[PDB]
Amino acid sequence: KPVPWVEKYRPKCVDEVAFQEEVVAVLKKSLEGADLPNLLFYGPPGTGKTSTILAAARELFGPELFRLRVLELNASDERGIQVVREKVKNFAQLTVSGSRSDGKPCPPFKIVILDEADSMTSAAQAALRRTMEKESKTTRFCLICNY
Amino acid sequence: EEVDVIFDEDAGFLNAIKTFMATTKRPVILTTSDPTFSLMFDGCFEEIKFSTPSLLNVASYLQMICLTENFRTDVKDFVTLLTANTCDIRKSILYLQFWIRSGGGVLEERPLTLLPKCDSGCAETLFGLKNIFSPSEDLFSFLKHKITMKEEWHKFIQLLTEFQ
Amino acid sequence: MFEARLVQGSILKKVLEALKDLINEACWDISSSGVNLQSMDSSHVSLVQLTLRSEGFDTYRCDRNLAMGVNLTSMSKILKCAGNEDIITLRAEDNADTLALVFEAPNQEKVSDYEMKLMDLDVEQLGIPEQEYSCVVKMPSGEFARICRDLSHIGDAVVISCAKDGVKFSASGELGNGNIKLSQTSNVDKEEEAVTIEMNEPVQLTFALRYLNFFTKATPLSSTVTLSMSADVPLVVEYKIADMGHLKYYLAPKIEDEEGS
Amino acid sequence: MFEARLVQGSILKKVLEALKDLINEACWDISSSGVNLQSMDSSHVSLVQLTLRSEGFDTYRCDRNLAMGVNLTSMSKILKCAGNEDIITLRAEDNADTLALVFEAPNQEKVSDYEMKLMDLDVEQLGIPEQEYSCVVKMPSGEFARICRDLSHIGDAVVISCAKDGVKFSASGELGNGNIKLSQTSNVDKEEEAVTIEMNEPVQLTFALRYLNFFTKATPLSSTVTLSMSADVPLVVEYKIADMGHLKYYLAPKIEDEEGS
Amino acid sequence: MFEARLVQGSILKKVLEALKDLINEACWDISSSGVNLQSMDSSHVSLVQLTLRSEGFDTYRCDRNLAMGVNLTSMSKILKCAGNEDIITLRAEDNADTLALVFEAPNQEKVSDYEMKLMDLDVEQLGIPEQEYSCVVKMPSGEFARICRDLSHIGDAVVISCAKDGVKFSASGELGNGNIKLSQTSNVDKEEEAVTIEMNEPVQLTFALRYLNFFTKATPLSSTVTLSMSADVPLVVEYKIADMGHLKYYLAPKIEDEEGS
Amino acid sequence: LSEFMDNMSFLDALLTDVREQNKYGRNDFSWTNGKVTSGLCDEFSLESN
Amino acid sequence: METSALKQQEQPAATKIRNLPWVEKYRPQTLNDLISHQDILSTIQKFINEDRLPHLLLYGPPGTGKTSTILACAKQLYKDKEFGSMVLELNASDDRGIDIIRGPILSFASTRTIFKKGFKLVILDEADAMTQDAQNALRRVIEKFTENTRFCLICNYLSKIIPALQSRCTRFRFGPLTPELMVPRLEHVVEEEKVDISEDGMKALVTLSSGDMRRALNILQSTNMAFGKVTEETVYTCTGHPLKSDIANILDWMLNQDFTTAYRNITELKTLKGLALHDILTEIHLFVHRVDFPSSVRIHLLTKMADIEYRLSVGTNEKIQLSSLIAAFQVTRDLIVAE
Amino acid sequence: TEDMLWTEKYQPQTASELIGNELAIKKLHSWLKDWKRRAELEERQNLKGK
Amino acid sequence: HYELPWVEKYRPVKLNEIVGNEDTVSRLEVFAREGNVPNIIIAGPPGTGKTTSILCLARALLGPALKDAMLELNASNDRGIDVVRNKIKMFAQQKVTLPKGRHKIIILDEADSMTDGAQQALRRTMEIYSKTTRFALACNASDKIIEPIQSRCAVLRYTKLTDAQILTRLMNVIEKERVPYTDDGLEAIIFTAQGDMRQALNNLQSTFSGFGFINSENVFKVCDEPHPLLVKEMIQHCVNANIDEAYKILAHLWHLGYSPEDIIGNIFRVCKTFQMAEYLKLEFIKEIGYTHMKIAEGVNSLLQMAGLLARLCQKTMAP
Amino acid sequence: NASSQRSGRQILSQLKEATQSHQVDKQGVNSQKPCFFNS
Ligand SMILES: Nc1ncnc2c1ncn2[C@@H]1O[C@H](COP(=O)(O)OP(=O)(O)OP(O)(O)=S)[C@@H](O)[C@H]1O
Ligand SMILES: Nc1ncnc2c1ncn2[C@@H]1O[C@H](COP(=O)(O)OP(=O)(O)OP(O)(O)=S)[C@@H](O)[C@H]1O
Ligand SMILES: Nc1ncnc2c1ncn2[C@@H]1O[C@H](COP(=O)(O)OP(=O)(O)OP(O)(O)=S)[C@@H](O)[C@H]1O
Ligand SMILES: [Mg+2]
Numbered sequence A: 001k002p003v004p005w006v007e008k009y010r011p012k013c014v015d016e017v018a019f020q021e022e023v024v025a026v027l028k029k030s031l032e033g034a035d036l037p038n039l040l041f042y043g044p045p046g047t048g049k050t051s052t053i054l055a056a057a058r059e060l061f062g063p064e065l066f067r068l069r070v071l072e073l074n075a076s077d078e079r080g081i082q083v084v085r086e087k088v089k090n091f092a093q094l095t096v097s098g099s100r101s102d103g104k105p106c107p108p109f110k111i112v113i114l115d116e117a118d119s120m121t122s123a124a125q126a127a128l129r130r131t132m133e134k135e136s137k138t139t140r141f142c143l144i145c146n147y
Numbered sequence B: 001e002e003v004d005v006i007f008d009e010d011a012g013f014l015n016a017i018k019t020f021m022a023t024t025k026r027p028v029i030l031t032t033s034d035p036t037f038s039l040m041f042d043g044c045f046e047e048i049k050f051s052t053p054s055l056l057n058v059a060s061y062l063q064m065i066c067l068t069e070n071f072r073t074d075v076k077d078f079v080t081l082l083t084a085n086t087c088d089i090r091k092s093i094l095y096l097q098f099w100i101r102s103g104g105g106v107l108e109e110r111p112l113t114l115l116p117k118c119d120s121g122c123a124e125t126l127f128g129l130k131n132i133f134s135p136s137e138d139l140f141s142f143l144k145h146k147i148t149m150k151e152e153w154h155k156f157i158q159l160l161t162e163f164q
Numbered sequence C, D, E: 001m002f003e004a005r006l007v008q009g010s011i012l013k014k015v016l017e018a019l020k021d022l023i024n025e026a027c028w029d030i031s032s033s034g035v036n037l038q039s040m041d042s043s044h045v046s047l048v049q050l051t052l053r054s055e056g057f058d059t060y061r062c063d064r065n066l067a068m069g070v071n072l073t074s075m076s077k078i079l080k081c082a083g084n085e086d087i088i089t090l091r092a093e094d095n096a097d098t099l100a101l102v103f104e105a106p107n108q109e110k111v112s113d114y115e116m117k118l119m120d121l122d123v124e125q126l127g128i129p130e131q132e133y134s135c136v137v138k139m140p141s142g143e144f145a146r147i148c149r150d151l152s153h154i155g156d157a158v159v160i161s162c163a164k165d166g167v168k169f170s171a172s173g174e175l176g177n178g179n180i181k182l183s184q185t186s187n188v189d190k191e192e193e194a195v196t197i198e199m200n201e202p203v204q205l206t207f208a209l210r211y212l213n214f215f216t217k218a219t220p221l222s223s224t225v226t227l228s229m230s231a232d233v234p235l236v237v238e239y240k241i242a243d244m245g246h247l248k249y250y251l252a253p254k255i256e257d258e259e260g261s
Numbered sequence F: 001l002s003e004f005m006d007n008m009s010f011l012d013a014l015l016t017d018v019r020e021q022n023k024y025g026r027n028d029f030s031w032t033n034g035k036v037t038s039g040l041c042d043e044f045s046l047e048s049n
Numbered sequence G: 001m002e003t004s005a006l007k008q009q010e011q012p013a014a015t016k017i018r019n020l021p022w023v024e025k026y027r028p029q030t031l032n033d034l035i036s037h038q039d040i041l042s043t044i045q046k047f048i049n050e051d052r053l054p055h056l057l058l059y060g061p062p063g064t065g066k067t068s069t070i071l072a073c074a075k076q077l078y079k080d081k082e083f084g085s086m087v088l089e090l091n092a093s094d095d096r097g098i099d100i101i102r103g104p105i106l107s108f109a110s111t112r113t114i115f116k117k118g119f120k121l122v123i124l125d126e127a128d129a130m131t132q133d134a135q136n137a138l139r140r141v142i143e144k145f146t147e148n149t150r151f152c153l154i155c156n157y158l159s160k161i162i163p164a165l166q167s168r169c170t171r172f173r174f175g176p177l178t179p180e181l182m183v184p185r186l187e188h189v190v191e192e193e194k195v196d197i198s199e200d201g202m203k204a205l206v207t208l209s210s211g212d213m214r215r216a217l218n219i220l221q222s223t224n225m226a227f228g229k230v231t232e233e234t235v236y237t238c239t240g241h242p243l244k245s246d247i248a249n250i251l252d253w254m255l256n257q258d259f260t261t262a263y264r265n266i267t268e269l270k271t272l273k274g275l276a277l278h279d280i281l282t283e284i285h286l287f288v289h290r291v292d293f294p295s296s297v298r299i300h301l302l303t304k305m306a307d308i309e310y311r312l313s314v315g316t317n318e319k320i321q322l323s324s325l326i327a328a329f330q331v332t333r334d335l336i337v338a339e
Numbered sequence H: 001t002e003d004m005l006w007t008e009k010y011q012p013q014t015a016s017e018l019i020g021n022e023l024a025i026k027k028l029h030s031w032l033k034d035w036k037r038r039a040e041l042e043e044r045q046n047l048k049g050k
Numbered sequence I: 001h002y003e004l005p006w007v008e009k010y011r012p013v014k015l016n017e018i019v020g021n022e023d024t025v026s027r028l029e030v031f032a033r034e035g036n037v038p039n040i041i042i043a044g045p046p047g048t049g050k051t052t053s054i055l056c057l058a059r060a061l062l063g064p065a066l067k068d069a070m071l072e073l074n075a076s077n078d079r080g081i082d083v084v085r086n087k088i089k090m091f092a093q094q095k096v097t098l099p100k101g102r103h104k105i106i107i108l109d110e111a112d113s114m115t116d117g118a119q120q121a122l123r124r125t126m127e128i129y130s131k132t133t134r135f136a137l138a139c140n141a142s143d144k145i146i147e148p149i150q151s152r153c154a155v156l157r158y159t160k161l162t163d164a165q166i167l168t169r170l171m172n173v174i175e176k177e178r179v180p181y182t183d184d185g186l187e188a189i190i191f192t193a194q195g196d197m198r199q200a201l202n203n204l205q206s207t208f209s210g211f212g213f214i215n216s217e218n219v220f221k222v223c224d225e226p227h228p229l230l231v232k233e234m235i236q237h238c239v240n241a242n243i244d245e246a247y248k249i250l251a252h253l254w255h256l257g258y259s260p261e262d263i264i265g266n267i268f269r270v271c272k273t274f275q276m277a278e279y280l281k282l283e284f285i286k287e288i289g290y291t292h293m294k295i296a297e298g299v300n301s302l303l304q305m306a307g308l309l310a311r312l313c314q315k316t317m318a319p
Numbered sequence J: 001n002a003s004s005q006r007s008g009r010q011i012l013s014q015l016k017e018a019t020q021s022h023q024v025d026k027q028g029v030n031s032q033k034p035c036f037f038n039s
């Protein structure tokens, strides 16, 4: 029933993450246009990259459509990138209609938050590049790394 | 034969032979090489285990099959032949048939009392070492002496590769 | 001392293949009147009601009200050993812990007695409002079965809109919307056959497809089925077994949302 | 060159339909006397000995007494294509790897030449020695068919008992017995229906029922069937196809685990 | 902005079960002359050409040329629930990505609106001119169906040779080669159709079993079919529909090599 | 002898072997398992070795 | 299944009013329009024109122009009215196992053409991703139907193709573009697109691309639209590559100061720039052969950095490996400096 | 002029002709001899009954 | 009118034209001459002539009945579980009349691609039906064959062809095809085909069709390997412990687009036949193998290559 | 054998009466080995 502490007190929306000034500003500018580009966050762990991207996903979408329109994936899968590419293809192929009662309709693009993107070989990186180019205007990619 | 081999086409084979277990009036025999099938199968059955046979007895029997085809030989070569095949009688008999019916490998006489010429050199052709070396060359003779020429080096590398 | 005798062995097989997946634990409630099933789906979205009266049974006996719970996979294997023409006795005791299914021999081969367990987790008391519906319709069973199998390949949700013209089963999905309408009577080989409607006002509701897929398996229950559908109360797809009794399956609609602006 | 001409192809179709799931493969031994098909079954409990003499064929020529073996799955899949009113040609060489069935269809010119390959059967010819049977029964084949059906519902094993008034086909069951008594109906209009018993002494033996059903499935081949039965010999079910030949079924009795006193 | 009315759904359901797994995606091109289908197999060994006139429709009207494509799995799956005698309507816009199959009532009770999503795939007109053929024969649908079933049932390569005497359908397989000979003088009695020949030079070709089997799924479209085969031009299986249109089936023969000396 | 056996240890440790050792069981002389029966399904391996 | 329609109209899909796809702007059309690998293209055209076209194996790094080259060969060899009846193209996107070889490939290679007589062509993009058994079937399909049809296999890694499949074909490597003949393409596109760029921008563009035009144009348009100017600093900022001044300062700290101050400065700059140890090792390795060191110093440094780049792959603590990288220089060259 | 593999050319007709695994083959031979004795006893009982 | 490839134009038609593996080919010759062939499994590297050997043996055994008494199943056929259950067993049970000592032959090429279920089924149908049918299988890696078939067969071993044999048959093809050549082209072709007759014939046909003359420059223009003289100069500089020139040449090789894998492969192939001392050759081979496993495991950059260069240089300057 | 199709219904309906009943041929050719199979 209860949730762990790390996912409980993370900021609900943008501008609530302290110590960052321009990153949240550019994120708010992108959210006001209702169009998030392909995003790359790099920094040491326990800094707030995951919190910032999850807050942006919660801000742009609705909370009832927050989980349905984002997909969290890790790049350290043991079966190569074939399983990762097939999961991304399945997520991008499936489309879920959404409606927000707050007054702003949901943007059409889906969000794939990919963690540990710096543990990726060059062949797999080129495969991910061609996968992102295949879904350029339908799915905006998020890459999380330290380096 | 080979009860442990179950495919997806063999749907419900184990339940069928369990019904055969229950409602038989005639002997039923199961043969399998999988040691784990003695544990997985649920039923009442008398267990018989075939151990690996003694090397010298099977070697004498293979020498014997060689004799009844009118060739003489030594015990040690079939000993190492059995060792290479892990005392498999089927593999040894089939390779022995292929080897005897090809006319023999090396004609060397060995006068032993304990007469025609011996036919030693079965395990060398078994591993394909005769395709690498000249028929005058011996394996341990090649290995003991000093390797200097390029072709001897290539023979050494091909021998070690075939064993690697 | 509970002994119920069924006139045909196909009745349990045809009511229970529907109950293969929707219910995890089936709890028979026995009393003087007959046999009741109050099945409570593990997703907390569907209900199953069965009333089987005593006069349909060839013989039926009861001394006290009892509740016997049987696990879903535990009787499905034991029912397939009974033929449709076999004549079946269900026997339970007051204080013992075994349920006996005594089938008559398949064409007088050999008497097959099967034993199982009757421990229920709880009686699972549930109330039925006996409500009044704004739409009640008599429509064939096979038509609903082929509607479900046709819309099943599209998606996972189906929207129904009952109007005075007729019903309109619609299923929007990944490939394309499928729409089947039923109005007035119908022309078949039989002289009389109709999707007949008695109704007050047109209502529409959206439901999960897979739940109607498990109620589809109750197709040989009757030639026709009854549809009760209204604004708020859950949809009834009611099967009559003639003199046996009745069956009513409830499923909760999936609520829709309208855009504020 | 072996050349055989079936005047009517329906008889061969019917005998394969009588033995389609019974025997794995059909072995033919052919001489100047005619075609013989003495096929074992895979469990080796029943043997079919069908003999077609040379004079029953339109044309016939054998230059060397020969034996072939063809899988009857292939021989079953070929003969679906033929009509019921035509002729069949079976052609083979003295040493050939195939045999040809030629069907001239009832059209003016439609020739079907199916050249079927011969399997290298290792099993030699199997047949029981000739012996007098104490019990000889001349009896209608279709009435055997309905007895076999009734006992087939009732049971799977028949304790058949021959008595002076006829043969009684008694089932075995936990509660259901298919005891059907046959009396003398010789004084009847048609000699096929008339039952004559030439039994020397009564003898009791047990038989399975699936093989009896398979044997009696050949009822339209012959008007009446002879039953040859004696002590410790297989039961013979003989049909006489009038002017084409005679077929026999040898069915072994079930073994009995007799208990010591 | 295209609309179309069709007298019966039987013609469409038959022409769609003809091409279930033969064709991956079905792309019809539209014109004032009529409706056309230039499609080619995903393995690129066989081609289908369906040309239907405007006058064979109930009412035909167009505004501009357009070739639209649909996934044949979805186009098949929507049809299984169809009335064979039903009037149907096909409708599209000038630049919409959806094609609607407006379904009328098979039971005089329903109006249905199905939409299918187009896909954006390249299509090139395979511009084959009508060249002369060395052997043009006629052959019934039922007989050709049975003979293709039988030949692909035995062997894996249907070797068809057209000569002056008739059409020889051979199949050299692992089980045993089956050869079939038709003739000019032969006419069947099932549908009273005569095999007539327009032979010019003898031609022998070999084709795959399955693809001819899929071609041979199209029996109820026409009473008879036309086999057109030349020494270099591939096999033509042509069904002429009564007043509706024409269908054409191209299959390229297999590789056969000269036997070494 | 020590030099040769040092190179032999080098060959086993820091050189690739042809067949991947301890693929289905662990290394030799262990009582966990080792009764690895061969495959029993007609589906292909589809491996990326 | 399918998957070709999306690409097929993905290539002619643009806003055409705001988007600027400079990679897709300049594309070759024919063999005379690919101004690179003139020997390979002339050899292939000579093979086509003599009707002596053998099984081709086009291999090399991606983006060098293999697929467009063989598409030009297919369009020139067969006209548009018989392209679909004579050319069979497959990729690794339609991977269902090894049945792709026994499916379309075996059926298509075992029949004649339909309409116009001639030899057919099979193009297999990304053939190294094919499994070993599927390739072991493809070699037999190649062997028994070589006369009727020819096979052109496009792959990226030559080592993942079996020796038999290589030995049934002739191999053509699309090597990287020498920077010289690459630079005229860059000056043509900047002169067309009105971009401010210095010669350091050209050096960075020909360095990061390492002989390709696609990623080169990608880097060029990205840096141009992000900054408005293209220089060494702006390119290595937009790409996020190790800046040359930063690697120079890293080498200065490892070559002048003591252990602890160098360690603190390097760690501070690493967390300031997000710069890993693998890229530091690569750029320092490029730097070592340019800075005049003795032979023994160069050997020792190269051995130690090779060891550290091996240790970083198995996943140890990068902090300890960074301090050992500092130690590798403190052992030899700071001792020589103190000497 | 031989058409046999040596596995079947030198096939052991008797279990005593086998080599090795002596306890196993004597166990199997005793089991099958007991089954033969049971079958012969069943035939004797059938002959006594009729 | 069609240009038959020289692989298929000059395939041997008798077992006495096979070069390489003299003992096994002589035994195949005597078994084709006399008869009663056992179930054989021929294993070796690709290109050594296994399919050609079994085809010639089947032809010499059967003769005119080769179309009827031989069934061939390659990797491009189905060879599934049901195929082994029906088609192979039906061919084994088929009756074919053959002379004494001749049996039907079911060739199963590339038994590596035979799935383990098919092998498990094929055991008994290989075992019992040996009176009329015989099995001739061929593979590369015999470990992929399950142990019951190897028990049920005779395992014949094929080795890599010695360079003299590939030279002799290359000269036979050249003298039958009037190929203009020099000895440098002969050495280049033998280098580009490491004991692989198929690769040598294909490369020779490719350079003769491409440039028309057989010398080293044309062969390495068609085969497009890293040039063995450049790699020999690498190894020669590293013998002298000149890291600057060796890394100069390796940077040249790297900027030409050669991958790490074939670079270290060519370094090993040149270093195997290089003229230096035995101990230095051993240490060079050990370090080359260590670096090659590093390339195999996934780390493959210029830094690893130059590191191997530094280690090879330092093995000379350190006792 | 494993070379044959041996599914449950096939093996019981083809080989149960091999155990439950006698052999019709008991003298003569009996040292022969029917390998059970169904096509
Ligand atoms: N500046 C910040 N403002 C608000 N919350 C913060 C801040 N920095 C860290 N946190 C919280 O610290 C927790 C961990 O941060 P996360 O964003 O989940 O992970 P991270 O910082 O991306 O590091 P990773 O995911 O291991 S690379 C979350 O609960 C954040 O809300
Ligand atoms: N030599 C070249 N000169 C200029 N542009 C080129 C060249 N080669 C490729 N391109 C560009 O790359 C595009 C397509 O090249 P590709 O054929 O995809 O490259 P590739 O060698 O096949 O590697 P892939 O496709 O990424 S595996 C062309 O449309 C050009 O924009
Ligand atoms: N020993 C040889 N003597 C002569 N020609 C040979 C020899 N080995 C190979 N060849 C030639 O190479 C061609 C191909 O040889 P194959 O036998 O197909 O190779 P392989 O032994 O089957 O190995 P695979 O097929 O790649 S697993 C033959 O047609 C010959 O032209
Ligand atoms: Mg995170």
Ligand SMILES: [Mg+2]
Residues within 6 Å of the ligand: G066, G067, G068, G125
């Ligand atoms: Mg490409």
Ligand SMILES: [Mg+2]
Residues within 6 Å of the ligand: I050, I051, I109
């Ligand atoms: Mg081969």
